[PDB]
Amino acid sequence: ERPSDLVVNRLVLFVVKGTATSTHNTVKPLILLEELGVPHDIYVVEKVSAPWFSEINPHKMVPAILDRSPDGRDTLRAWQSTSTLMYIADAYDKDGTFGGRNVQERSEINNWLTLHTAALGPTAKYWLYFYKLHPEKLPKTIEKLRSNITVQYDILERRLNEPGQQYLALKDRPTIADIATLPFAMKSTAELFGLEFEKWPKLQEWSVRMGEREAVKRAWQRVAGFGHGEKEYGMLE
Amino acid sequence: SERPSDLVVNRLVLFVVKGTATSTHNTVKPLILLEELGVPHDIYVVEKVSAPWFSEINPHKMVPAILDRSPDGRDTLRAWQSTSTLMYIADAYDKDGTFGGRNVQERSEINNWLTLHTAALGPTAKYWLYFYKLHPEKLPKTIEKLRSNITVQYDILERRLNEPGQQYLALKDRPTIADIATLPFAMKSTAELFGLEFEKWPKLQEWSVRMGEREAVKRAWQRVAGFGHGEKEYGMLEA
Ligand SMILES: [Cl-]
Ligand SMILES: [Cl-]
Ligand SMILES: [Cl-]
Ligand SMILES: [Cl-]
Secondary structure, three states, X not given: XXXXXXXXXXXXXXXXXXXXXXXXXXXXXXXXXXXXXXXXXXXXXXXXXXHHHHOOOOOOOOOEEEEEOOOOOXXXXXXXXXXXXXXXXXXXXXXXXXXXXXXXXXXXXXXXHHHHHHHHHHHHHHHHHHHHHOOOOOHHHHHHHHHHHHHXXXXXXXXXXXXXXXXXXXXXXXXXXXXXXXXXXXXXXHHHOOOOHHHOHHHHHHHHHHHOOHHHHHHHHHHHHOOOOOOOOEEOO | OOOOOOOXXXXXXXXXXXXXXXXXXXXXXXXXXXXXXXXXXEEEEOOOOOOHHHHOOXXXXXXXXXXXXXXXXXXXXEEEOHHHHHHHHHHHHOOOOOXXXXXXXXXXXXXXXXXXXXXXXXXXXXXXHHHHHHOOOOOHHHHHHHHHHHHHHHHHHHHHHOOOOOOOOOXXXXXXXXXXXXXXXXOHHHHHHOOOOHHHOHHHHHHHHHHHOOHHHHHHHHHHHHOOOOOOOOEEOOO
């Protein structure tokens, strides 16, 4: 059974209480919702281990989405931050401003999106797990993952050194590839990994360029504050 | 750093390595979809993925990768990462959305189960194989934890395939790029490599057998094993 306050009248983004370590994935779909001006609700999940939430995301993590299908026949779900980006782009990015407008654009967007989804994302997640969650400390495993993060930063730096390549996928504008990468490729996260982010200057410039976008600023502010308003858990008003 | 003499893009070119049990589980993915759709393609066997010319195609220096002509045929584009190669082939060649999804509902579930593989089982299995075989030192505690995480992913797939009428991972009716992406890491042979008894996930095992019976899947496994063992060891194969 779902909580009484969980109703799907529009896109519902599932998050947890905003902390330094709880927002780097939930901010991704929120950035795109803010960029496109998509009507949405915020549901603050008290416990991702709750059976009702496992029915939405079998992987028992945020972010997740419930939304009405375009024809209203189905309640659609998206889970895994990358999948939430793909869903919002599919349902709401009519012009392919962030999703890509042609086969050529989408070929590069999916390259750099999938690089994050398969490489930096999981490497960073395993680094964080072994660094402070695993019951035993495994420094050789932690060091190899931190080494792999620097290899990923090197690739992103190489791309952003290519002539006129202002964003990861497309030269001209940010895409879901850029939104997916940003939280794991900015100064604060680099410092968490014990890295000097200045050693990737084009990647740092890119992170500042992304960070100056009003939609990104709004997303970071809101994700920090979720659960710290008048309501702690459930559907925010 | 120049491209090899025999590398030309007159059609889709799929970059692979010499076929072994542990070199083909990612390259087989786009090859399955190419065989399913009947896409005309060439195979290029990469001798050294560390070669500068190859990093200009895939900066991550791994197979699979694709070079293909743009739709209008005036330009060349690239796809790298097995998941990206599947998304590209579906975009360019699956206009009916038979494997890519025909609407927002279908694509929502396809992208959920495709991304689960791309984010969870795929990277976990990759790190497992790396620490098990490739890493200069053996770290059995790391290896054991990754093996445990594989069983958690198998548990999720098993739950999904136990849902009423859920014959495939994403859609009830037919297999999609989500099923193609998952199969190589969720079959009896791979489960045995990880030191797992695949029978503990009966609906997942039944699903892997159903997928394996598809003629395009049989052709892909048959071909990917042979690449680099024919009359030409490296470079553009003749087909
Ligand atoms: Cl993800
Ligand atoms: Cl996530
Ligand atoms: Cl991938
Ligand atoms: Cl891959």
